[PDB]
Structures are given as structure tokens and as C-alpha cells.
Design a protein around this ligand. Structure first.
Ligand SMILES: O=C(O)C(=O)N[C@@H](CSCc1ccc2ccccc2c1)C(=O)O
Ligand SMILES: [Fe+3]
Length: 199
């Protein structure tokens, strides 16, 4: 399916309410914002981060920064719920040493999407990324190592966690425009957490 990826469906289902509380807490400090791409377009996905580092635009490029450029303060500390869930998932998937210092939190309103990309900016690409999906379902599309590799699609639903290791860590991937709907925990949106070793 995706070589090296370990899909754990509903792994975060029981933790989801706490996770969402923690997302709200994080956002009360560093608010969700829609970043501007180099190229000048406003992303449809809104973002924030927690942990020592967080992903952001700066100076018409992207990077991991210890300071949130919007507040000029550090990103909020990584919530225990986040840290512990990530560790359980990574450990089950065979990455017991994974120690994320960054968690990017993506929020999707109806229609929001994430264009096909690789995550290339972490210092060691042997370290996995761990995603946790919450709320409304989204169609995840994924390629291969080359931009033009044939795309496959799978639905990511509430509570689904995936550890993207091995070859899959390098795949081009994205999220297709979110279908509108209702979810009891998130109301009208989807959240996705991605845990990274950025330092
Ligand atoms: O944050 C990202 O970089 C990202 O692409 N997030 C999407 C997709 S989740 C699945 C996912 C996340 C990160 C990956 C990083 C490397 C390879 C495969 C990945 C798959 C989202 O917000 O739902
Ligand atoms: Fe990505």
C-alpha cells in the first residue's frame, strides 16, 4: 500500500476529546493562521504549532522556528496528550526512539486542501512523521518518490494515526478539498497533527 507506512486506524479514538481540548489550548496561545506561500497565495488550511519548534513561513521561505512570528513568543509547549499518543504510536510502529520537537496542527474548514508536496525540511529523513486525524474525514492522496508517480487515495477518518516511515516518509502526498459535514467533537472541521523531529 505505502511501503514503510504503518496505518493504525482509530488509534487516537479514545484520546480524541483530550487531544481536541489541547488543540484549543494551544490555539489560545498561538492562534490558527492561514500562511502565505512563496508565490503569494493564502493557504486554505489554517495552521499553528506546539513544541520547541514549529513550521512557518518566514522571509518568503519556510522553516522551523522556536518563535511564533505572529505572537513573537515561543510556540506553546507540547501537550502531554500529544507527546504520549505520539510515543505510543511510534513505538508500536517500530520507532521507539522517535522524539518529536515539533507538532504542526492543520485545521481544515470545508473546501480546504493541501496541495501535493514532500516534507523535505527535517534534518534526518530516516526519522518518521506521525499524523493524527481528528474530526471530519478527508481523502489523502499519495504518490511515490517522484512528483509524477501514480497517485493512490485513502480516506483518513477521526482517530486514525499513521506512522510514515521508510520509503513512505519521502512520498509526495496531499489532502483533497474537505467535504462539508458534521462531527460531534470538531463540529464543522478536520484537524491533523503531524509530529516531526525538526532539530
Ligand atoms: O502536515 C503535513 O505535512 C501534511 O501533509 N498533512 C496532511 C496529511 S496527513 C498524512 C501525512 C502527514 C505528513 C507526512 C509526511 C511525510 C510523508 C507522509 C505524510 C503523511 C494533513 O494535514 O492532513
Ligand atoms: Fe506533508
Amino acid at each position: 500500500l505505502a511501503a514503510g507506512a504503518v496505518i493504525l486506524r482509530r488509534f487516537a479514538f479514545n484520546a480524541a476529546e483530550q487531544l481536541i481540548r489541547d488543540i484549543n489550548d494551544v490555539a489560545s496561545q498561538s492562534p490558527f493562521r492561514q500562511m502565505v506561500t512563496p508565490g503569494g497565495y493564502t493557504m486554505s488550511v489554517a495552521m499553528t504549532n506546539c513544541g520547541h519548534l514549529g513550521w512557518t513561513t518566514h522571509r518568503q521561505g519556510y522553516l522551523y522556528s522556536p518563535i511564533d512570528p505572529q505572537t513573537n513568543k515561543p510556540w506553546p509547549a507540547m501537550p502531554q496528550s500529544f507527546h504520549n499518543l505520539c510515543q505510543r504510536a511510534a513505538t508500536a510502529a517500530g520507532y521507539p526512539d522517535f522524539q518529536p520537537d515539533a507538532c504542526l496542527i492543520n485545521r481544515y474548514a470545508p473546501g480546504a486542501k493541501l496541495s501535493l508536496h514532500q516534507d523535505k525540511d527535517e534534518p534526518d529523513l530516516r526519522a518518521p512523521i506521525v499524523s493524527v486525524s481528528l474530526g471530519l474525514p478527508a481523502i489523502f492522496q499519495f504518490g511515490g518518490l517522484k512528483r509524477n508517480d501514480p497517485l493512490k487515495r485513502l480516506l483518513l477518518e477521526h482517530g486514525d494515526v499513521v506512522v510514515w516511515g521508510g520509503e513512505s516518509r519521502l512520498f509526495y502526498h496531499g489532502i483533497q478539498p474537505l467535504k462539508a459535514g458534521f462531527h460531534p467533537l470538531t463540529i464543522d472541521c478536520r484537524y491533523n497533527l503531524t509530529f516531526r523531529q525538526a532539530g
